[PDB]
Design a protein that fits this description.
This is part of a larger assembly, with 2 copies of chain A and 1 copy of chain B.
Chain A lengths: L3 E2 L35 E2 L7
Antiparallel strand pairs in A: 1-2
Chain B lengths: L8 E9 L2 E9 L3 H13 L4 E10 L16 H9 L3 E3 L5 E9 L2 E4 L3 E2 L4 E3 L5 E5 L5 E12 L1 E2 L12 E3 L2 E2 L3 E10 L9 E9 L5 H20 L5
Antiparallel strand pairs in B: 1-2, 2-15, 3-10, 3-12, 4-8, 5-7, 5-10, 6-9, 11-13, 14-15
Helix pairs in contact in B: 1-3
The chains are: A little secondary structure, B alpha+beta.
Organism (chain C): Vibrio cholerae serotype O1 (strain ATCC 39541 / Classical Ogawa 395 / O395)
Protein name (chain C): DNA-directed RNA polymerase subunit beta
Function (chain C): DNA-dependent RNA polymerase catalyzes the transcription of DNA into RNA using the four ribonucleoside triphosphates as substrates.
Amino acid sequence: GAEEITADIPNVGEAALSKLDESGIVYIGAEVKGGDILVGKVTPKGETQ
Amino acid sequence: SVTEFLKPRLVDIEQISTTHAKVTLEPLERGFGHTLGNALRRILLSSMPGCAVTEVEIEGVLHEYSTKEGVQEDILEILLNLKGLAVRVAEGKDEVFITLNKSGSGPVVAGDITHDGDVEIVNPEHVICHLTSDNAAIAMRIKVERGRGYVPASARIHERPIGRLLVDATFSPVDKIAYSVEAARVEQRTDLDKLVIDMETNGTLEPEEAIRRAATILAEQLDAFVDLRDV
Amino acid sequence: PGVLKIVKVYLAVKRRIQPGDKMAGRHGNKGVISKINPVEDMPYDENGQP
């Protein structure tokens, strides 16, 4: 499929989505530390055993 | 006699300026002047309380690495200038908010800050920024905290809305301390000696009170030795 | 080809001096900072300037 940039990131709580907007891109002026999500991207994955 | 010493007393404050003073302790016995001077210099230069700017909120500003229309200085330079603000907070308050609103061409100084009467600005002539247009306007909310030592923005424990700019705070008001130990004329003896402490500060903290806090700290840490036991 | 969207984010990091940083003059005397000593532990002159 096609990779999509969005704020609907699986297995991630609302704490890491605070600095993201509706489009899934971090706000301008947001103080970010290591491990913080700046752009939320989800890629389609095949069947996993 | 020999086993009894002469207790020094505070005899003079000479206020050369609002940021420079001299305090005289007299009488001091042989060797005690140097010991007390070094101890008081080390305590005063490191462990004395004060009030410093900790948070700034400027309207229309999202981060320090930006510019505001009509202001010659960048926001980072404005924060650096605010770091040098000398603020005296009345006792009982560890957190004050002071506002700075200005419109029109001209330098913006510390005397233009509106405070609720519990905050005194010691250096009203301190320059924060320059407004270069008649239509230029600045509106800032500054947070003043009481503290001790140097607490950088990173070291502060971690929500924070975007726009609140954290400023490194140097709470210590004492900048320079120099002590000179000279001869003192007391009664008929020639062994008593006199300590002169020259304090260069930001004007927030009085000389006599600073000396008293330094002595209190020294005695309070000495109490452990005075009551030496296995703990 | 094959690229749909590129998002670039710019981060500004304030790096302060700390032990391990390389500092040097203009005469070839380079060095690494070993300790950030307190002001009260620095040598000072007769006027009290450390």
